[PDB]
Amino acid sequence: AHENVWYSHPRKFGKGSRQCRISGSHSGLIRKYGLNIDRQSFREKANDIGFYKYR
Amino acid sequence: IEDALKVVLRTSLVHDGLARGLRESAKALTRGEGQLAVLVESVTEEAISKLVQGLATENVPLIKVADAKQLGEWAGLGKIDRDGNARKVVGASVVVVKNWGADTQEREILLEHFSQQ
Amino acid sequence: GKKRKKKVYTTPKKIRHKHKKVKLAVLNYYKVDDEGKVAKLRKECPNCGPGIFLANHGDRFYCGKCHSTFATQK
Amino acid sequence: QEVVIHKIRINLTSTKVKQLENVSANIIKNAETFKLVKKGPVRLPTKVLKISTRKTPNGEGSKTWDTYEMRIHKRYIDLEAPAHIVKRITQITIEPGVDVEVIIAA
Amino acid sequence: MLIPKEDRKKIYQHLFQEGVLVAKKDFNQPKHEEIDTKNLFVIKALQSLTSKGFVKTQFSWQYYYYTLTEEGVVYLREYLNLPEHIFPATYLAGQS
Amino acid sequence: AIISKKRKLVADGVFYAELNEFFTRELAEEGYSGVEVRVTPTKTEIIIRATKVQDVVGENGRRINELTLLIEKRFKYKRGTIALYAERVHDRGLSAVAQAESMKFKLLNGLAIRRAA
Ligand SMILES: [Zn+2]
C-alpha cells in the first residue's frame, strides 16, 4: 500500500494501458476509432452501436 | 448545574472540537485551539491534572469537576444504540473544546465565574 | 485443469509490527515546576508551531509534523 | 440591420440517408423561399466504416469472419447570404440522428 | 477501512450536495474527478453506507452509481448536522 | 473539441450503447423498453419509452432528476444539457423487450414455466 511501490510501474502503453470499457478485459481490444472494446462485447452489441452486417 | 458544558460538547462535536485525551488536549491547548478545558480531579495518578493545570496557566481557563468515567459517559464516547451508555465502558481523562460552535447560552457565564473571577 | 499443492514456506514467519504502546507518554513531554511554570522536554518544532515536541533518538530531532523534512542533527 | 455577405457553410453527418435527404431538401427550400444565392447540397463520397471480426468468442472452430459497417454521408451547402436569416434557418427543422455543423467562413 | 476523517466528511457533504456520485472501478487512481480525492476510499465508504442501508448501488460498464434514499438523506444530514429543511439537489424539483 | 466526424459518430454510438444498457440495468424493475437520444443545439433530449412510466418518474418527479444527474456526472456534461422524458410504450405487447422482461420477472418469482411462457 506504500505510495512509491504500489502501482508504481508506468502504464503508458501495452495491454494493461487500455481496457474494455465494458468488462475491462485486457484481451483483444478494438482501439480503432476509440472503441477500446473487446471483440466479444463488440459482437454482442454491434447492431446497437450501429455496426451492421452488409457484405 | 453544568448543563451548558454538554451544549458546548455537542456543538464542538458538530465542528470537531473535542481534543479528547491528554496529548490531543495538550496539542489543542499549546496551539491557539484550546478554548474550554475539563480535567478530572478524581485521578489515581494525581499528576496528569497538575501538568494540565500548569499548561493551562501557560487558553487559561479550567473547569475540572471530578468523576472521569461519568465524563466519558456524557462527553459522547461510544456508539448510540440507546441514547445513554450504549458503549460498554469508556473513560475520558481530559476533554478540551477547540471550536466554540453554535450555542453560547450559558458558556460565557460559567468560565468567567470559575477561573476568570 | 490446474491442481496446486499446499504452499510450503522457506521462511519461519513475519508478523505485523504491533506498534509500541507507551504508558503515559504525555507526562514525559511536560514537567510542572511546583504548581506553576511548565517546562518542555526534548525539543520543539519552529515550523509546525509551538507544542510539537521533537524526538531525541540518535542525535536527530525527529518531529511528528515534518517527519520527512525535519530530522535536525544536534 | 445585417446584410453583409458571409459565404456560410453548413455540413451534415448521419448514418441514415433518407432523413438526411429530407433535412437537405428542407434547408434548400427554406433558403429559396428567402431568395438566397447558394450552391446545391454537394455530396461528398460516402464514408464506409468497417470492422473485421472473428465470430468465435473462444478461438476454436472453423475460421469464420464478419464485417460490420456504418455508412456516413457528408453533404454540405454554402450560402452567399447574411447571418441572421441563415441562423434562424439552421436553428430550426432539426430531427434526431442528423448532425448539423456550421462554419461562418468569414 | 483506513480513511481520513476530513476525507470522509467532505465526500459525504459533496454527496449531499448532488445526491448522486460516480466512482469508476479503476483502482489506484490518484484523484477522483470533481472530488479531489482518491477514488478508492470513495468506493469503499459508499459501499459501506450501502451495506448499512443508506445508499443504492449499481454496477454498469465498470462504472459505479450511488444514489441516496430517504433514510440515507436523513442520516447524512445528521452527520453534517445540516438543518432539516434543506434537501439535496435530487429534491430540487426541476420539472420537465 | 476538434475531433474527426467519424470518431465523433463512433463516440455517439458507444454513448447510445452505454445508455441503453444502463437503462436495462436500472429500470428493469420499472419495465424499461427503449431509450432515444436527440441532439438539439442547446440541450440533448433523452426519452425513456417504458411500461411503468409513473414508477420511472418517481415521487415528486425526483427519480428522473437523480437519474439525469447521474448522466450529468457520468459523462461530464454540464448542468441543464441533459433532460429526461418518460413516455408510455406504444403497445407493450409488440415490444418484445417488455415481454422478455415480464417473462424474466415471472420466472424469478418461481412460477409455472410452461404457463408463463
Ligand atoms: Zn514538524
Curated annotation (Swiss-Prot), chain A:
Alphabetical GO CC annotations of the entry are: cytosolic small ribosomal subunit
The family database entries (InterPro entries) matched by this protein are listed as: Ribosomal_uS14, RIbosomal_uS14_euk_arc, Ribosomal_uS14_sf
Q: Which UniProt keywords apply?
A: Ribonucleoprotein, Ribosomal protein
| Record-linked Gene3D superfamilies | 30s Ribosomal Protein S14, Chain N
A single GO BP: cytoplasmic translation
NCBIfam families linked: PRK05766.1
Which family would the database say this protein is a member of? Belongs to the universal ribosomal protein uS14 family.
Q: What is this protein called?
A: Small ribosomal subunit protein uS14
Q: Which organism is it from?
A: Kluyveromyces lactis (strain ATCC 8585 / CBS 2359 / DSM 70799 / NBRC 1267 / NRRL Y-1140 / WM37)
**What gene name does this entry carry?**
RPS29
UniProtKB/Swiss-Prot annotation, chain C:
Chain ranges of zinc fingers (C4-type): 45-66
Q: List the disulfide bonds.
A: none
Q: What does this protein do?
A: Component of the 40S subunit of the ribosome.
How does the annotation summarize its subunit structure? Answer: Part of the 40S ribosomal subunit.
This chain belongs to the protein called Small ribosomal subunit protein eS31
- Organism source for this protein? Kluyveromyces lactis (strain ATCC 8585 / CBS 2359 / DSM 70799 / NBRC 1267 / NRRL Y-1140 / WM37)
